[PDB]
Amino acid sequence: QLTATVKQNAENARQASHLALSASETAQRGGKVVDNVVQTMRDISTSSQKIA
Amino acid sequence: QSRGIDQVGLAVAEMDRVTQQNAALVEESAAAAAALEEQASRLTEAVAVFR
16 A cells, blocks of 8 residues: 555656646746846837837 | 554564564473473483393
8 A cells, every 4th residue: 555655656756747847947938938028018118218 | 654654563563572472482382392302311211221
């Protein structure tokens, strides 16, 4: 019974590692996507001010 | 798992005492068996005088 839970906890650890690792990479890729928008919002601000 | 190990710990504790009790029976049986050798050796030795 213990071996059944050990392999279960060990198996879930590998599955959770992929989700945790994928979540980290998903945040890094999403971070750059959000950082690029920051420069875009400023460009639109300068563009709007240029129209003024 | 912690609760399961506890059952194994208690199970081992029961075998620990049983193992010690078995040693007494094994040791007592060895001492009792050795006594038969002394008694048996005395019978064959007592009648050894008769050719």
